[PDB]
Design a protein around this ligand. Structure first.
Ligand SMILES: CC(=O)[C@H]1CC[C@H]2[C@@H]3CC[C@H]4C[C@H](OS(N)(=O)=O)CC[C@]4(C)[C@H]3CC[C@]12C
Ligand SMILES: [Zn+2]
Length: 258
């Protein structure tokens, strides 16, 4: 009886195996745009993905992960609210059964169709596993998806999903350029938070871009054809793999923009 997104193992159950689920810096949150304070001390985000080397895509039974070779100093996130340099290890999405839900962060209670997370670890802690034990171990770049025009840079991801339909399936996924998933503007909100799945560790500096990317109805429909279940198990469509907004508690959301 492992955690997942269902009635019997979903977010409202996670606290039993992961008591930090009710902690002081849990993610995601609602971003109240009127209460978020412009912080002129925040720096422009530095997103340097020119040398990003993707290796593989994996269906882990919760989402699909596009994994990167993080063995060298290549794909790095720095500046914005961050001290030092954070290395890209993977990206994944959260999405809905319908276009009206799927994002984890909300903006004045608005839910987007999906949310992209680019996960980076603080190079001062030497690897991903050690970084998640630290309050400044990870920087996750969150990007909203709305349904409209296709995102051409997403299509290589969409086209490989047929080959990883079920939990435990992986596929070679080399030479994927994550710059094709970024919106024009790097205006952002930032706050201290957590992983949004178990183990829910409070190790994340969240950086959530204000500008969504547009993806087509056809692109997101192909996300919704994936399966939570393994090959030769009863079909459970991989939809609604999002955690709802959690209490903000003693936290300030800061805006990079006026
Ligand atoms: C058991 C482990 O080795 C830990 C160390 C790093 C952990 C990961 C930390 C990064 C997060 C990001 C991701 O979610 S999110 N939505 O907070 O960006 C899901 C869990 C995952 C992959 C974690 C899975 C458990 C990992 C691999
Ligand atoms: Zn995520």
């Amino acid at each position: 009886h492992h955690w997942g997104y269902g009635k019997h193992n979903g977010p409202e159950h996670w606290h039993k195996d992961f008591p930090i689920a009710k902690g002081e810096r849990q993610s995601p949150v609602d971003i109240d745009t009127h209460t978020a304070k412009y912080d002129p001390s925040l720096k422009p985000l530095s997103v340097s993905y020119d040398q990003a080397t993707s290796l593989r895509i994996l269906n882990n039974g919760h989402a699909f992960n596009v994994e990167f070779d993080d063995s060298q100093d290549k794909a790095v996130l720095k500046g914005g609210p961050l001290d030092g340099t954070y290395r890209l290890i993977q990206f994944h999405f959260h999405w809905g059964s319908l276009d009206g839900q799927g994002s984890e962060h909300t903006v004045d209670k608005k839910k987007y169709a999906a949310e992209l997370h680019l996960v980076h670890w603080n190079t001062k802690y030497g690897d991903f596993g050690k970084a998640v034990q630290q309050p400044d171990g990870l920087a996750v770049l969150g990007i909203f998806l709305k349904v409209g025009s296709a995102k051409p840079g997403l299509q290589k991801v969409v086209d490989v999903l047929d080959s990883i339909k079920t939990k435990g399936k992986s596929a070679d996924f080399t030479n994927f350029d994550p710059r094709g998933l970024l919106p024009e503007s790097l205006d952002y909100w930032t706050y201290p938070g957590s992983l949004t799945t178990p183990p829910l560790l409070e190790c994340v500096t969240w950086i959530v871009l204000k500008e969504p990317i547009s993806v087509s109805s056809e692109q997101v429909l192909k996300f919704r054809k994936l399966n939570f279940n393994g090959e030769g198990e009863p079909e459970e469509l991989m939809v609604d793999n999002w955690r709802p907004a959690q209490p903000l508690k003693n936290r300030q959301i800061k805006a990079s923009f006026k």
